[PDB]
Structure formats: structure tokens, C-alpha cells
Amino acid sequence: KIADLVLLLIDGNFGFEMETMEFLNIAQHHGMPRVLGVATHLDLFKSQSTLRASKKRLKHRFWTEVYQGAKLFYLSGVINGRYPDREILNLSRFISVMKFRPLKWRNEHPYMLADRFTDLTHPELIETQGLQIDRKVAIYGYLHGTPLPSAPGTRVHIAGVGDFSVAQIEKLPDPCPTPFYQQKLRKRLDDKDKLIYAPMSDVGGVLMDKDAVYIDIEGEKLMTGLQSVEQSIAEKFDGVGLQLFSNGTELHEVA
Amino acid sequence: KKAIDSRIPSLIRNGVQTKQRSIFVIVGDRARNQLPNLHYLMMSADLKMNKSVLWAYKKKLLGFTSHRKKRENKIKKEIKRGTREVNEMDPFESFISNQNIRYVYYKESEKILGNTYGMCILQDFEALTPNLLARTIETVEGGGIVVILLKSMSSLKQLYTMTMDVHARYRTEDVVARFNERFILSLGSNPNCLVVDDELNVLPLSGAKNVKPLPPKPPKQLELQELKESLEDVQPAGSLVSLSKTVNQAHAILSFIDAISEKTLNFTVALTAGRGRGKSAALGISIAAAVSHGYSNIFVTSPSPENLKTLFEFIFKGFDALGYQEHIDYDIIQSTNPDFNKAIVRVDIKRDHRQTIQYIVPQDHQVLGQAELVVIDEAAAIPLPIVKNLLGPYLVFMASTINGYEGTGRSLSLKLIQQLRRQLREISLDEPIRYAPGDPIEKWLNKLLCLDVTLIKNPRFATRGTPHPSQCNLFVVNRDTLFSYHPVSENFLEKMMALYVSSHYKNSPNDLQLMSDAPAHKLFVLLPPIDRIPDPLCVIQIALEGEISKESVRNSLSRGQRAGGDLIPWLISQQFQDEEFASLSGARIVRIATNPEYASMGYGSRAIELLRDYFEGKFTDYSIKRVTLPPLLLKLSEQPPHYLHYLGVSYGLTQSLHKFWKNNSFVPVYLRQTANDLTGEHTCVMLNVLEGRESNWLVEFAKDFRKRFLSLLSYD
RNA sequence: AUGGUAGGAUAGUGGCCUACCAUGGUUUCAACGGGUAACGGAGAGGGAGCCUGAGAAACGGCUACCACAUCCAAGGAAGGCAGCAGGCAAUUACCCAAUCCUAAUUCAGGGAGGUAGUAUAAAUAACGAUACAGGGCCCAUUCGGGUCUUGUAAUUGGAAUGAGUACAAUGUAAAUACCUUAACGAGGAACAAUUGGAGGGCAAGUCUGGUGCCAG
RNA sequence: AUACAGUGAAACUGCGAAGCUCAUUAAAUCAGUUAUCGUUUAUUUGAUAGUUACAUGGUAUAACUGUGGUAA
């Protein structure tokens, strides 16, 4: 009900499955979006003749569900967890040039996909009442469809949850500023401008879940020595006294 | 997937929530690879933070270059050679790839003063200087992160020795680098400082050992939003006050508007604040208010027009708030002089009636007869006689910086206020615009650099009365102890710093390096009679200068960098070309500071007299352990004096100082022809010969200087 | 412009150009000019200029000018992409073997070149045996007339082989494809081609109008 | 291999670098043929120069060693 574009993975060796066409019927029944078929596991074929025949049967059947002449991609195998570059490059141009038809359902209501999830309930309330207590939650993301009214109290549904009312609404600057927008604040896209923003996913090497963050990665003796230090430097200062004069008493703390 | 120590995510999240900055110290060869992660953690905490990154380095970049096509040209080369995959690009490269990083040298720290950066990364620990610290840390925003990269092995060894025992200080094979050792110990005292390794393990020596995550969410903003809402209908006040970021400067802008409304030409408005508190925004907004009010001839004066760029920018923002449009309502005129770098000089405004804003050199006060308003920015840098001439029968706005750039001593501002006591209106801005008030790092930066130190009147002196000149005896100060960061030594250290700053005209942050690390400098304190931390009454900073420094110089040239210079021997050489004087061992009194309140009773003279006897021999190992602390002060008899031939002074020629040195048996040898631009005074070098040493050469120099002086009365 | 004398330049002839001299040259036997199914010569961002070499006013390089536009610490640097290929979307992968060539050359290379990638003939079936029943078909507006081995919506038997499943060799620069060729491969032969048309008939079913049991 | 002698990065020498897109033009394009005693011509091929020396100089530097500037 929300996917503007869909990439449909079909096991070429095995063929179509229930979970595929059911989405097509659900997509057919809630507003057909742009539908792109990608065929995989084709390297499993041992003969070229059966591969071509299998490709022909699959592409024609994909033309029954989706408009005849629909674009269907074919992927052979996976190397280093990566598909062949060119077929992966070929689909780049298609997705870039796709224009999307106006859908009645999507163009009349506001919707937005949760980029990240955060619970704002005070930890003290979680303890004095217990975990059972209802939780204050903040959900972030980009708005789609018709504009969302600025005044709070708007009624909104969350799939698999129930109906809630918007307690508070505020706009934040863009986490993933598009190139024409970022530089604003026939020419190819500059590779600096290309950006990736994924809060929940691990981008680079850092993954964040709940409030704990996870990352992947003579001097060595000294570092273990520093790490094993117990007393704080401020505490060590307390013990230190200084002689103001050569024969004067050690003065510890100024009154 | 390792779980990072929970202390680091809590500190970054806390500081963002309270709008406080944070310091991180990363130790390790792979230290650079953690900056991407630490930089990513920023936006996750809060997205609104500034994404621009400041990074300072001395000469070379850690493992890369700051030009793009070379990186792309190289990355193409590894891919084609096959060493790297076609699309492989590490996180450290990714951090540099997409973020806006400003590459800056340590020497050119002046350029970064105005701009605002979310994060500052400091490459080199050894080359750190107070100006490079005060300047860079001030450019970080509230919730920002400061990082210092202690990658050097010698720094790594230095950290080990202090942590194992604070008493022992690691020392390599003449620079002692005590301040850098202070920087380490002080970093521990900061509550919002975490020192970490390349594996993101929080080393325990940090002060931020118990930083706990604060609960989810200021009164300052409430007092500001209400004020803006109340004044929205009242133009031009509403639009101009809307630009205010803070409560105090909004009051200052309102106070300026009141002065503009009063129309009294004998009125004086003095704006005093620290650097980064938004004086220029207040002054620029106030100027825009005068244009809308109806003032025609508006003047602006400063030591150079280049410093006024930030002011004129904020005037135009005020003009935008007031509905003025460029090329229709006003025109901007830029300088044709190459020295001013196309700095804006004049703004002509045509709405209602012809109004003009124009820059003037401070010396050109004769044009001010027609001035309705002059705005004097950075009056601390202008000579006192000149600013007196600038105080004409017209409205005057003054912005003077306390502890900004070179600025001036606090007492000099106080002397200016006493003179004004012409109606005087005083405005003070205390609360910063860039971060939360009372940020630990500013509190921390102040104690390390002692910028915010203030002189205090001592009640016990009043009860006992002022000590007679004869009673006190001079004490030598041990630098290692004074520079150990003990609370007693720090509080003792502050007291000299107060006397250091208050007395004389100009004081740069880098001076605290010069007293600390350089060996030739020795500190003398004129303490009261011993009968509590002793309170200094006069402080003399002297530099050994002559043949004795030559051994140090030769070592410096062996290193490949000449360190410092011998001022007086060089001047006397270029002037008289006397080979003997260079060979002669002598001492230069770099500075002699006395309490302004107790001036004229003779503290300065006796300390010189006691100093003169000490080096004359009339009064006839304290080094810290090198990988329990020795006494803080050493008596004159306890330390042998070095053999000296003369005592020298260098100071701006003034009648009060010249009389003071004339009474102390000092003889003039030279006077600079060109006036120091900031003071307008002529530098003079005066010498005094000690008993038991030849005095013929001074007499010959004195004869020449008079004949030089006599003919040069006319020229300059 | 036609020509002579002399000179300048070319690799050289020559108004090709230069100084003087004569007023000439083509043409109603079609000069000159116009149209055309005369695809039946030019440049590499735009003009000007230079440089190399046997051969280029060079799809090479250099100078100034006119515009485009990139990076930057704003002090400078550099580009010819002002391109190419597409739509109103995969032009890729393998080679110098085969025909040829450039070179300090047998051997190096050539996106010259080559290799591969993405309307025409067949099959869906053929041959028997048995059992059980008397109706099957043709003509005719009309009434009726004409003719004889038939129907199965019944049971059953042994043979044949193609698409597929595929071991090989051959083929080739190698490889795909082609040709040839072991084993397996059918009764719902479910190993389950369609498209269009003409008629039916059925309910404790529904509706509408009537001269009941009717009609639509 | 007691001058080096196999192979050989780099550098100095030698040789060769000579499809597309727009416009359009009547024997001024092009085709056939003549002449160059009016010319240039790498290369191929055949001929062709009797008119300190038991071997001269850096009047020479690259590659190379090392010191640096620059955002580049």
C-alpha cells in the first residue's frame, strides 16, 4: 500500500512462488505500483537451451500479471555477496528514469515510513509503576502523500498496532540532503554528493540498538597499564601536598 | 561487533541535551579511524547540529592529502593495479568524502575565528599553543565535540608516567614543555573530558569516569521567546530584536535603541564582553536601528577596516530584517586599497533621506565635527590618547574586549571607566551565544590558560596595613612547582597571572608558554614579610640574554630550528656594532608588574633594588624527577646567582615609566623612531651596569644616543 | 579580367602574386544565370596564427581573443565533454587464430578484423480383439417420402516413437551453435493447443403480465 | 668471466603515429586517358665515394642519491 517501486525477486531455477504472485494480487488490489522483476539463481542452470526456454516462460508469465513488455532483469550469480556489476549497473538507469503514475489512495492521505525508533518514556516511570506502564514514543521519518496538518491531535493508524493521536509534531532538517539541495545551501552527479542515511542499519562499521552502540574493528604494554589504573587523577591530587617554602609544611588544600 | 563503553555515548548525548561541548582524547596509531564513528554518533544524538568540521594541523596530513583529484587519481591507481577492489572505500575515507572539513594550519589560526564549526579535531599535541587552543575551542558550538590526537609515542610515554605517579614527569634528552604536562593533568580535572584509546576503551585517568546518561528533556530561552513575542508589533524593535540569540545582548540592543531615541549628543555607551558573546551582532543591529530611526551621518572606526567585516555583515542582516534591499535602498562601496582586501568602507542609504555609514581611521578625528554617531569597535587596541580625541560632542558606541584577541588588561578598561566618571552608560554581556552558560570546557579552558583570573583586594593587608618597603624580601619562584597543577600552586599561579595581566597594556595568550617552557626566563616574586598562601605584591620576569644563551642557541640550531632571539644584544649590535656587548652576559627584565591599587608607594623600585643586589652577589637540585615536589619558592641565598654584567629593560616610552627607570639608575641607549601602532608610544631600551663590571661602554652609547636623540627630536 | 616583359614564391610550370605595358577573353554552334529522385564537400566549443615530418595547413601540440564550465585554504590551477549513447532505454563478453598490416620486429600489438551474447516444415497418435443394444442417416414450406450394418457417454491386447531427462565425441583461437550418437522417456498416453459460433435442458429458485394448469 | 659479457625495471636514443557529425553540390564532383624535357618522394630494389688514431672532449646530463616549497 506504500511501495512506490517494487523489486520482485524470482528464483529462476525454481520458478514462481505463492509469496510472489500474492503480493502482485495485493498490489493489483490496493493500487498497482511500478513493478520490476529481477530473476536470480540462473547460474544453477547447466544448459543454455533450458536457460533460454526458462527465461522465455518466466518473462511471458510476468507479462500476464504486469503490462506486456514489462522490464524483467536477469541475475546469474553472487560473488563476494555482490551481483555482477553490469546487470547491477543496467538496472540503475531504468530506476533513475522511472516516472510513477498518480495513485488514488496514496495521493489523498498522509503517510510516512519510520526511519528510526525511540522510546521517550522516563526510566523512573518504568520502575515506580513497572514495565507494564504505557510508553511515550517518538517515531521519525519523511512525509509522503498529502500534507500532514501542523496542529497536534491528528488521528493516525499504525499497521499492526492500533489508532493513536499525534501528541506532538515538529520538522527537523534533512538527514540525507539531496545533491541539488545540499549544494544550494547535463552535469554528472558528483561522488561527494552521493550519501547514505540508515539509522537502524550499520552504516560504515557502527550499529546502534536501544541505548548501546556497537562497532566493528612497548606501547601495547603501556596501554594495558593505563587501562588498569584504578585511582582517578583527581583523587591522586588529594594525596599530593606541596611545600610552599624549602622548610615549610606541606599544604594540601587551600581554605 | 564489540559493545562500546557506555560512558562515551552518554557523554555525547548528555552534552547535546544540555548544549555543552565535550573533549575526547584518542591515543593510538589508528586514532583517525575512530573520528568517523565519533562523528556519526553526533548526528544520531541530534541532527540539527552543525555538520562542518574544523581540523588544525601543523605541516602534514595524517596519511592523506587535502586535494580531491589526487585522491581520485590515486584511488583509480590502486583499483587499476588490483590492490583495491573497484568499489572498496574505507570508513575513514568516507568521513572525509562527504563531510565539509576545513583544513587549517596552526599558524593561520586567525582565519578560523569567525566561522562556526560543529566539531574541531586537533592533529598534533606537541605543537599545541594557547592561542591555537583558545581560538579553536571557542569555535565549537554547544553540544560540539573537541578531539585532540595524542598519537606520538613520546606523548604516550608521558601519559604513562604521570598516571602511574603524578609527581614524576617524563622528560626527554632545553625546552621543558611543562604546559603540555599541565594540559594533561588539567584534562583529567575536566568533568566532561574522556581520554580513550584506538579501541574505544575509556582510560580511567579521565575526569569523566562517572558520567551517567541524563533523563530526556532552558530557562534562558523562555526569557528570550517571550521578549521577542512581546516586541513583534513594535517595529523596528521587533524585527531587530528577533535576531538576538541571547537575553543579555537583546537588552544591550534595547539599551542601544534607548540611546538612539534619547538623541543626546553627550551620551556614552560602553559595551564590555568576552570574545564570542555577540558584541558585533549587537553593534551591527544597533547601527541598523539608527538607520531606520533617521540618523544620517553614521561613522565607524577601528584599528583596521578588515576587522569590521563581521560588523558590516550583521548590519546588512539588520537591514534585511528592516526591509531594506541592496541596490534599491542602499549601495555598498568597497576599498580600492590592496591592504584592506576589498573591505567595505562606506554604505550609502537613500530611503526617506540620504544616510551614510562610513569607515574612518581612528587618527582622522577632525572629520567627526559632523558625526551624529561613531561606533568604536575594539577600543582596547586603540591608543588611549587617540580614543580621547575620538570622544567628541556626539553619540558614541564603544565595544571593548576583555580577554579577546590581544585586547587589553582589565585595569586599563577600569581606568577608562574612571575617566568617563559626559554621561556614561555601561552595558555588560556575560552569557555566550554559542553554547550553554557555564560550559565545563570554557571553565576548563580558563583555568589552564588563566584567562578569566581576576585580582582580589586582600583584607588582611588592610588590617595589618601596607608593609613598609624595607621589610619584604624577594623570593625566587621554582617553575616546575608553579607548573605542577596542584591547587595551592594553581591558586598561587593565578595570583601572579592577575598581577601579570592587570598592570601593563597588552597580554597575548601565548605568553604563558614563554614563562613556562623557555629556560632563560626566571620568575621573582616580592612577597610580604613572613609571619595562608602568600599574596604577591610585585612580580619580575627576567630573561638571560647574551653569551649564556649561546649554548642553548647552538643546540637549537643543531635541532634545525632557531628558538627565540636575543633582543637587546641584537639592537645594540645593529646600532653600535659592538662585538663586546654581544659577548657580555646580561639580563633583560621582560616585565615588572605591580598592583594598580598600591602603585606609587615603591614596591617596584625595591624589587629592582633587591634584584640588583642578588645578581651582584651581595646575598651570597630543585628539578623535578626525570623519567616529593620541591618547594614552591626559593630564597635568594639558597640559589646562586649567575654572573651578569648589566641589567636591561625594554618598554614603551612614557613619562611615568621613564621617571621610574630614571630613579632606578637606568640609562637610555636607544629610542625607536616608528611608533608602535597599537600604543603610539616609542619603544625605549635602558641599561644599568652592576658594580664590579666595566662601565665605559654604556657611557659611549649614552653620548651617541643623545646626539642621535638631539637631531631626531625634529623628524618623528 | 585576356596577353607580353621583368621580378617574388613553389617541390616545381603558370597572373599564383608583384612593377610597367596592349585592351583584351567566352557567347544565339547557347557564354552567364535558375531548378532538380545531381546520396543520385566540410569541421571536432567559435574564428586568427604558429610548430613536426617523406607524406597532415594534422580529430597532435603552442600563443593571444571570444564564450562554456570544474576544484580551491579564494593565493591559483586545470578542461575541450559545448562529447558520446539512449527514450519520448541491458551494446556487452572472448581473441589476434583466419585475410591483412605498423615496429629497435619470427615472437610485440591492431574496437582493422573475427567469434559469441539478445513468413517455413512436424507432433498432440497408429493397429487389433471382445461385450452389450436397434436404431442410424438423407430429402422435403406442407403432409410424408427415400436408404441400410449400425451406436457405445462399454471392456480389452500387444507394438512404434517424438518433445523432454541427457553420457559422449565432433565442432572451434577457446567456446556457443550445427551434425552424429550411449542410457531413460506414454493410456487421462494429466507429457492436460486455442479461437469463434449454433442449439438445448434442469430447481420445493427469483421476477413481470395474463382469459386457472399460461406466456415473457 | 678482474674491463663487462645471461636476463633486465627506469631513463636517454632510433622508427611509426597520415569510425562518427553537418553541409550539399550538373562534366568546376567523378570516371577514362595524355604530359611532367615543369616537379617532391620515407621505404623497397640495382648500382655508387682510395684524395691521440692500439680511437679525442664534457665543451653532459637523464634515470639515480639526497634537501625542500605548495591545497594542488
UniProtKB/Swiss-Prot annotation, chain A:
Residues 75-84 are annotated as: G5. It is found in: Cytoplasm; Nucleus, Nucleolus. Residues 40-43 are annotated as: G4. Residues 1-101 form the Bms1-type G domain. Belongs to the TRAFAC class translation factor GTPase superfamily. Bms1-like GTPase family. BMS1 subfamily. GTPase required for synthesis of 40S ribosomal subunits and for processing the 35S pre-rRNA at sites A0, A1, and A2. Controls access of pre-ribosomal RNA intermediates to RCL1 during ribosome biogenesis by binding of RCL1 in a GTP-dependent manner and, via its affinity to U3 snoRNA, delivering it to pre-ribosomes. GTP-binding and/or GTP hydrolysis may induce conformational rearrangements within the BMS1-RCL1 complex allowing the interaction of RCL1 with its RNA substrate. Required for RCL1 import into the nucleus. Interacts directly with RCL1 and the U3 snoRNA to form a stable subcomplex. Component of the 90S small subunit processome also known as 90S pre-ribosome that consists of the 35S pre-rRNA, early-associating ribosomal proteins most of which are part of the small ribosomal subunit, the U3 snoRNA and associated proteins. This is Ribosome biogenesis protein BMS1. It comes from Saccharomyces cerevisiae (strain ATCC 204508 / S288c). The chain holds residues 133 to 429 of 1183 of the full protein.
Swiss-Prot record, chain B:
Coiled coil: none annotated. It comes from the Eukaryota. GO terms for cellular component: 90S preribosome; nucleolus; preribosome, small subunit precursor; small-subunit processome. It catalyses: a cytidine in 18S rRNA + acetyl-CoA + ATP + H2O = an N(4)-acetylcytidine in 18S rRNA + ADP + phosphate + CoA + H(+); a cytidine in tRNA + acetyl-CoA + ATP + H2O = an N(4)-acetylcytidine in tRNA + ADP + phosphate + CoA + H(+). GO terms for molecular function: 18S rRNA cytidine N-acetyltransferase activity; ATP binding; snoRNA binding; tRNA binding; tRNA N4-acetyltransferase activity. The keyword tRNA processing applies. ATP binds at residues 276-285, 434. Acetyl-CoA binds at residues 592-594, 599-605, 663. Its EC number is 2.3.1.-. It is found in: Nucleus, Nucleolus. Residues 525-630 form the N-acetyltransferase domain. One of its GO terms (biological process) is ribosomal small subunit biogenesis. Keywords: Acyltransferase, ATP-binding, Nucleotide-binding, Nucleus, Phosphoprotein, rRNA processing, Transferase, tRNA processing. Its main location: nucleus. Disruption phenotype: Leads to a strong inhibition of 18S rRNA synthesis. Deletion results in an altered alkali-soluble beta-glucan phenotype. Heterozygous mutants show haploinsufficiency in K1 killer toxin resistance. Belongs to the RNA cytidine acetyltransferase family. NAT10 subfamily. RNA cytidine acetyltransferase with specificity toward both 18S rRNA and tRNAs. Catalyzes the formation of N(4)-acetylcytidine (ac4C) at positions 1280 and 1773 in 18S rRNA. Required for early nucleolar cleavages of precursor rRNA at sites A0, A1 and A2 during 18S rRNA synthesis. Catalyzes the formation of ac4C at position 12 in serine and leucine tRNAs. Requires the tRNA-binding adapter protein TAN1 for full tRNA acetyltransferase activity but not for 18S rRNA acetylation. Interacts with TAN1. Associates with 90S pre-ribosomal particles. This is RNA cytidine acetyltransferase. It comes from Saccharomyces cerevisiae (strain ATCC 204508 / S288c) (Baker's yeast).
